[PDB]
Design a protein around this nucleic acid. Structure first.
Lengths: 142, 142
DNA sequence: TATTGTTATACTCTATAACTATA
DNA sequence: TATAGTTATAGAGTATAACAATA
């Protein structure tokens, strides 16, 4: 009455998706007090590390295509978490910077991520094992 | 002039998703001679391990919603790789088994993924490091 | 001419409600 | 009523072409 998972247990791609989907699902739950998807979260994180960059640069480093990034920024900018300002140098581009509200929302989101989510992962595995997992996934992506 | 990846380097969710997409992309390419998506591959693999089952049982085990599974089978049956047969006891259920064609297409894809894909990725990590990766990703999914 | 932001569009995936034919 | 398979639909996510403003 339970099905045999056959050779699927040994396909690494398969393990990654179902591993990715629960981690993302858990991310949405833990972080729901600030209402940020993982994509929105990373956009705030990248904006925080690299102030002064433009849409093309932020979107590419994240793997987001620029036609799909426009709608994401409208959400965050509509919620008053970041600003598009025209660069005086080259008025084709929008330089992107965080608001104070954005910096606060990034701050508390960072806590719910570390305390409720990322730390709950680190204890279910080795603190060293989780770093090895993170290293390998980083290697796989290159 | 290159972007600071900030705390994203330590977001496990992000590393999990971007690791998955290179693997899924690499999978698609290696298996392109047979025309099978990774999902279709697993549907054929699980049918091979679990003959005599119905749609609801196959679909639910894979995370496919049953309304989404219909067209997915339409494809594989249209390709003559598996067939729907009504069980005489309960004619609401469709019993699914792979055809001779289905198994031939499966044997082959299994060889294409094993040689070009799964073997190539085991080699970019330690053969022992990769089994620890598959162990941990399996752990995360429960 | 090339690039930035943008619109429009399309194709996949995923999600939900409701039908049909059985039971 | 309840369940299996199906249909239609709606929403994400992602992909490309093209156009206006600007370089």
């Amino acid at each position: 009455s339970e099905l045999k998972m056959g050779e699927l247990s040994e396909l690494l791609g398969y393990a990654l998706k179902r591993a990715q989907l629960r981690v993302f699902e858990d991310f949405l739950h833990c972080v729901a007090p600030v209402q940020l998807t993982p994509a929105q979260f990373s956009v705030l994180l990248l904006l925080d590390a690299n102030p002064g960059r433009n849409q093309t640069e932020i979107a590419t480093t994240l793997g987001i295509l620029r036609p799909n990034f426009v709608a994401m920024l409208d959400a965050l900018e509509g919620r008053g978490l970041c600003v598009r300002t025209r660069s005086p140098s080259d008025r084709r581009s929008h330089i992107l910077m965080l608001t104070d509200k954005g910096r606060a929302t990034l701050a508390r989101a960072k806590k719910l991520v570390a305390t409720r989510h990322e730390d709950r992962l680190t204890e279910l595995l080795g603190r060293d094992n989780r770093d090895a997992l993170l290293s390998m996934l980083a290697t796989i992506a290159r």
